[model samples]
Target: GEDDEILQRAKDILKEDPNRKILIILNPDGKIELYEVTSEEDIKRIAKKAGISEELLRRILQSFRDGQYDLFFIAKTEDDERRARELKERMGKPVEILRGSLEHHHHHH
Candidate 1:
C-alpha cells in the first residue's frame, strides 16, 4: 500500500507539467503496462498522436528517460517557430528543429 501511494505521488508530480505527454497504457488485469511499446502498431499509434514521424518518435523514445531534458521543436509555420522559441527560453534545454517550411513533405498540424 505504501508503494502504491508513493507511485501515485510520483504520477501527481509528473502531472504538474501540462506539456509533458506520458502514456500509461494498462493491461487486461488493470496493471500498469511498463513495456507496451514492443510492437510496431504501438509505435505507429504513439507517433501519430504526437504529430511526429514514426522514425523521429522512435528516436525520442530510445534517446531519453525520466528526469532527462531533450526538447524537440517541430515547427510548421512562423507562429509555430515563435512558440518553439518561447518554449526553448522557458525550458532552457537543447532543441532539435525539424522545420516543415523547408521540407517538401509537409504535414502541417
Candidate 2:
C-alpha cells in the first residue's frame, strides 16, 4: 500500500511537469530517445555528444513549427494512438506523430 502510493505520487509529479524540455532523437530503427534539455544551446551540445551534426540538428529544430514539439509513436491500433495522446495530454503538452525517417518526415511535412 505504501509503495503503491509512493509510485503514484512519482507518476503525478511526472504529469505535473508541463514545462519539461526535451531532446528527442529519432533513431534509424524506429526507436525514439528523449533527453532533458534546460536551454536552447543545450540542444546543440547534447546533439554533438550524441554524434549528431550541427546542420542536421538545426534542421530538426527548425522543423518544429510554432513549438509543436512533435512526439512520434508507432501505433498499431486506434487505442494505442489514443493512449499515446492521452499520456501527452496528461503532461499538458501537444503531441504530433511523424512517419518514416526524421529528416523525410520533417522535410515533407
Against the correct fold, how does model 1 do in TM-score? 0.35
User: In TM-score terms, which candidate is top?
Assistant: 2
Candidate 2's displacement at residue 62, Å, is: 3.5
lDDT values for all models: 0.42, 0.46
Q: Write the per-residue lDDT of candidate 2 for residues 1-109, one digit (tens) a residue.
A: 3323432443344466645444444444434445555446666676676556555556445544345553323333344455445455554444554222234223553
Residues 59-98, candidate 1: write the lDDT tens digits: 5455334324333334445555664455445444355444
The lDDT leader among the candidates is: 2
Worst 10 residues of 1 by lDDT: 26-35
